[PDB]
Amino acid sequence: GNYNYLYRLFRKSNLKPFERDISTEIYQAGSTPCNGVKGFNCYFPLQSYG
Amino acid sequence: NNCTFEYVSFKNLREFVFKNIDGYFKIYSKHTPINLVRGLPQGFSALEPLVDLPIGINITRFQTLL
Amino acid sequence: ASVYAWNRKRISNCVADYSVLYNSASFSTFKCYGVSPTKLNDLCFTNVYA
Numbered sequence: 001g002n003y004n005y006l007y008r009l010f011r012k013s014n015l016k017p018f019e020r021d022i023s024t025e026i027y028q029a030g031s032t033p034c035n036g037v038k039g040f041n042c043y044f045p046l047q048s049y050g
Numbered sequence: 051n052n053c054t055f056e057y058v059s060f061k062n063l064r065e066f067v068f069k070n071i072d073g074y075f076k077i078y079s080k081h082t083p084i085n086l087v088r089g090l091p092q093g094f095s096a097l098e099p100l101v102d103l104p105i106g107i108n109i110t111r112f113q114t115l116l
Numbered sequence: 117a118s119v120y121a122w123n124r125k126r127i128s129n130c131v132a133d134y135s136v137l138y139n140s141a142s143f144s145t146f147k148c149y150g151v152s153p154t155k156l157n158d159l160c161f162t163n164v165y166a
Contacts (some may be wrong), residue, residue, distance in 0.1 A: 018074075020106050
């Protein structure tokens with residue numbers, strides 16, 4: 001696998017036309033705000049095709 | 051760092067409009083002389099397009115330099 | 117079940133609250149493919165197999 005390429009797998013809402021978003025902030029799918037660390041339903045938002 | 055763009059070109063009122071629809075950030079402007087009054091002038095004016103800048107970002111806050 | 121002879125439950129004619137599953141913080145892993153967990157509760161299917 002080549003892991004250099006990434007796509008955003010999770011976001012709070014859809015991008016507007018030509019909106020662009022670098023942000024690596026932890027995605028809260030869970031009940032509790034994630035304090036900037038990974039956990040159960042506290043996901044890192046960018047994932048590789050590999 | 052990260053300058054995606056760079057450019058060089060109370061009696062005065064300078065007017066501007068900033069708009070951020072779809073691709074990139076539109077700016078319009080005008081100048082007119084005015085009487086020395088704290089309120090805006092009653093005579094009509096219209097602002098002319100300048101640029102559509104490669105900033106790529108939402109914008110939410112701003113300030114003036116004296 | 118033993119993994120050489122796994123058990124399949126056919127799921128039909130019912131409401132699938134997948135949040136009962138993905139909010140169960142007792143689980144040692146959750147993953148999902150083709151769908152994000154928060155989107156699962158909007159979907160509809162002819163059959164589901166567990």
